[PDB]
Design a protein around this nucleic acid. Structure first.
Ligand SMILES: Nc1nc2cc[nH]c2c(=O)[nH]1
Ligand SMILES: [Zn+2]
Ligand SMILES: [Zn+2]
Lengths: 382, 390
RNA sequence: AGGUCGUUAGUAUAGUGGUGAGUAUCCCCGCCUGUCACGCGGGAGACCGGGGUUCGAUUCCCCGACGGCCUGCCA
């Protein structure tokens, strides 16, 4: 791993990793997102349509929940997972459970965790988890952890302390088991930080986790109602003070355009990218602008209304996706009301492209260090 | 001014091989055309379809006149502009809704009254209205409204339908307004009765029509009547204009009927059967949800050339179909359309270079193995025209 | 260590000392010929284990296992 830091201004890191993958020949920019997938491919897209999207990033994001079922097949294939799913040119990262479908609380013990798949609920100990990682051969993989406390929003200190100790035990055990073997040695392992809503725990966890040769960190349990968005923002800046400044930072559960611009401020590198999927599944289309130089007003438009039935215009002026080059609003309304499949495809191709554009623009602006103007432009709408 | 040019005609049978000269480019006959009713092909963008090779597509009148309606579709520059497709189109007359939606409508000498199957409203569909709305859509071949009865009914109902269809034919000829830009196709009716169909042929051959089509032969019925009816129809029709057989889609049927002198086909089998999870192959089909395809690392078909048969294996498609992601239904569709297009091209080239009778033997051998195990209804049809296998 | 609560299909939840144990999802078969169709039918699959009470035990009492919570010990 190699971290570059061109500029660090106002607690807004800018950089690029240059030595990652097999042995190199790959570069990843910071900050960025990861492509979101369901069991292999992007949702509603096949490889032909997927390559009509401009600016797809270089690393994807599998979920252990979706792929855990098909485990006895990948061992027979013997050759990794970028070759089984026919995407043999990108890095991969295997998270534990997907952010869209939350995990009901009240199943974590001191021996195993649980994950909700299509066939039901399956619990896993340390050995199973290491075996699956060996079979899949992904570049990165988040260790087995304990994060059941986010659901309660209020509980005794005993549960929180028990959680922190649990997570430490898991990390140590898996570190040793991976060290022993051979194939696993070419994949990096990342650390997890939790502690609820206590300063003491949020400090002790970070202090104790920093003293292991993991290669990056995960900050877990920082989402909630807009009524606590100061007590869930000072804590973060206090936390990111006990971690070495040479490894990437990841944050889970934050994907709205407005919370991201403030989560980056305390120092964070990589983000999930599932929000455009939500805004698509509901039937709407993203329309906010992020061009700073030139839902209240326009954050998305709803296309099942009646006003969009004699409307002959693209969804967004100047969008370069396939939809905005060929079709009109009337046609998409006709598709939506009459319940067609092509509507999902044409809207996903637009929402993804819009979001990726946003991340490219914010990275460029942070390079030029004009984040205040863009923050004001985004805030005044949603 | 004829629209068909002949190139090569089999010297052993009655198969032909030619080309159509339509207002948007030209098509090499025979041809198969897939069908997309509500101004889209189900689940697949037009660029994919165009790049697969296809050259002419379908549409429907009842549905499009219901919602969104003629008034704004005309304002969207017809169904070419509305759908965004740079090739030829062919628009059906909505007469099939008269047998599919049988228990939802009534018909008199004035028209047909339909109660919508999405909200129970009733309206009228008469020959003038049907031809008018089709004139608004602006296709390349336009069909006349006809009084379709089921191919499983008897009684004086068939005679009424035949004569009413003739009367409506003359009314809609008088109602046609763009004789230069569209080709109206008389539709031959008569069920499965020799005399009635002969009368229909004799009567409506006297009218001036660019083309002729053969109707009322679809779904489940004895195939022994089916091929005899096609053979009767083909001989009486003239040789300077295309034939057209409506609603046949399986492979064996296509080949046999090519040998008997047909030129065009239509069906919904491949697209719809894709969305239920099944694929088409030189030996039949595969159902990619069974457990037998779970660890099978080869392609769908080694000799295929579709985008799907070059990247992905059977195991991956099996695993992907078991999730909620719908992208797995856009792979099967591409394969099935490609499959259908290749077969017609192969047969045509087989006949141009004077080898057609030996294409059939190989195809039967592949499909059924020993050429002595073909359906008995295909042996009779082939042996009647000259092609002998076994 | 002690106290207390709980255990029903592959995976969730109603229900009772006398019910073919209910429902929704997985699993297994069948149907598709110019679209009422990402559809429509049919099937299969369970009361932790042991002992006692009761005409009858998934229903009442006792033991074991496994797990949660509280206390004790310890930090
Ligand atoms: N108009 C019309 N369409 C179809 C489609 C299949 N058969 C028929 C028919 O007889 N008439
Ligand atoms: Zn767009
Ligand atoms: Zn193929």
């Amino acid at each position: 791993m190699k971290l570059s830091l061109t500029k660090v201004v106002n607690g807004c890191r800018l950089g690029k990793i240059k030595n990652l993958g097999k042995t190199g020949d790959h570069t990843m920019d910071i900050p960025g997102c990861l492509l979101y997938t369901k069991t292999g491919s992007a949702p509603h897209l096949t490889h032909h349509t997927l390559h009509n999207i401009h600016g797809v990033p270089a690393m994807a994001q599998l979920t252990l929940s979706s792929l855990a079922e098909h485990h006895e097949v990948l061992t027979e294939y013997k050759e990794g997972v970028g070759k089984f799913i026919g995407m043999p040119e990108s890095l991969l990262y295997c998270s534990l459970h997907d952010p869209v479908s939350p995990c009901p609380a009240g199943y974590v013990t001191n021996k195993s965790v649980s994950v909700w798949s299509v066939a039901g609920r399956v619990e896993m100990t340390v050995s199973k988890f290491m075996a699956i990682q060996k079979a899949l051969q992904p570049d990165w993989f988040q260790c087995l952890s304990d994060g059941e406390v986010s659901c309660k929003e209020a509980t005794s200190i005993k549960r929180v302390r028990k959680s922190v100790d649990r997570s430490l035990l898991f990390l140590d055990n898996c570190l040793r088991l991976q060290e022993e073997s051979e194939v696993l040695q070419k994949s990096v392992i990342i650390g997890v930080i939790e502690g609820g809503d206590v300063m003491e725990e949020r400090l002790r966890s970070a202090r104790e986790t920093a003293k292991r040769p993991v290669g990056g960190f995960l900050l877990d349990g920082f989402q909630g109602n807009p009524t606590t968005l100061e007590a869930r923002l000072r804590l973060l800046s206090s936390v990111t003070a006990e971690l070495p400044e040479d490894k990437p930072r990841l944050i889970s559960g934050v994907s709205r355009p407005d919370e991201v611009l403030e989560c980056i401020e305390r120092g964070v590198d990589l983000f999930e990218s599932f929000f455009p999927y939500q805004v698509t599944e509901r039937g709407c289309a993203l329309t906010f602008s992020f061009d700073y130089q030139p839902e209240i007003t326009s954050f998305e438009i709803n296309l099942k209304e009646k006003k969009y039935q004699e409307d002959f215009n693209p969804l967004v002026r100047g969008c370069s996706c396939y939809c905005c080059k060929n079709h009109t609003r009337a046609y998409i309304h006709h598709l939506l009301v009459t319940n067609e499949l092509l509507a999902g495809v044409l809207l996903m191709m637009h929402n993804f492209e819009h979001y990726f554009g946003f991340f490219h623009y914010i990275r460029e602006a942070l390079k030029s260090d004009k984040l205040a103007q863009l923050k004001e432009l985004i805030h005044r709408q949603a | 001014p004829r629209i068909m040019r002949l190139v090569a005609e089999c010297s052993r049978s009655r198969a032909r091989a030619g080309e159509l000269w339509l207002p948007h480019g030209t098509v090499a006959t025979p041809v198969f055309m897939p069908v997309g009713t509500q101004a889209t092909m189900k689940g697949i963008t037009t660029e994919q379809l165009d790049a697969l090779g296809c050259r002419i597509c379908l549409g429907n009148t009842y549905h499009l006149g219901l919602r969104p309606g003629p008034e704004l579709i005309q304002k969207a520059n017809g169904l070419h502009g509305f759908m965004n497709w740079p090739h030829n189109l062919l628009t059906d007359s909505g007469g099939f809704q008269m047998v599919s939606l049988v228990s939802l409508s009534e018909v008199t000498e004035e028209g047909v009254r339909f109660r919508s199957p999405y909200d129970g409203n009733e309206t009228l569909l008469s020959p003038e209205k049907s031809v008018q709305i089709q004139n608004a859509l602006g296709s390349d071949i336009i069909m006349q409204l006809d009084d379709v009865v089921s191919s499983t009914v008897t009684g004086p109902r068939v005679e009424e339908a035949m004569y009413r269809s003739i009367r409506w034919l003359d009314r809609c000829i008088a109602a046609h307004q763009r004789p230069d830009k569209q080709n109206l196709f008389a539709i031959i009716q008569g069920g499965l009765d020799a005399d009635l169909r002969a009368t229909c042929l004799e009567e409506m051959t006297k009218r001036d029509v660019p083309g002729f089509a053969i109707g009322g032969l679809s779904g489940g019925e004895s195939k022994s009547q089916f091929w005899r009816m096609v053979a009767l129809s083909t001989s009486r029709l003239p040789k300077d204009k295309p034939r057209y057989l409506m609603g046949v889609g399986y492979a064996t049927d296509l080949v046999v009927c090519v040998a008997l002198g047909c030129d065009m086909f239509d069906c919904v089998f491949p697209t719809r059967t894709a969305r239920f999870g099944s694929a088409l192959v030189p030996t039949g089909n595969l159902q990619l949800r069974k457990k037998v395809f779970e660890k099978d690392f080869g392609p769908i078909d080694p000799e295929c050339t579709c985008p799907t048969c070059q990247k992905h294996s059977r195991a991956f498609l099996h695993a992907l179909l078991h999730s909620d992601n719908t992208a797995a239904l856009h792979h099967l569709t591409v394969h099935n359309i490609a499959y259908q297009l290749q077969l017609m091209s192969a047969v045509r080239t087989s006949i141009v270079e004077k080898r057609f009778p030996d294409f059939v033997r190989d195809f039967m051998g592949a499909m059924y193995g020993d050429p002595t195990l073909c359906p008995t209804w295909a042996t009779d049809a082939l042996a009647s025209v000259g092609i002998t296998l076994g």
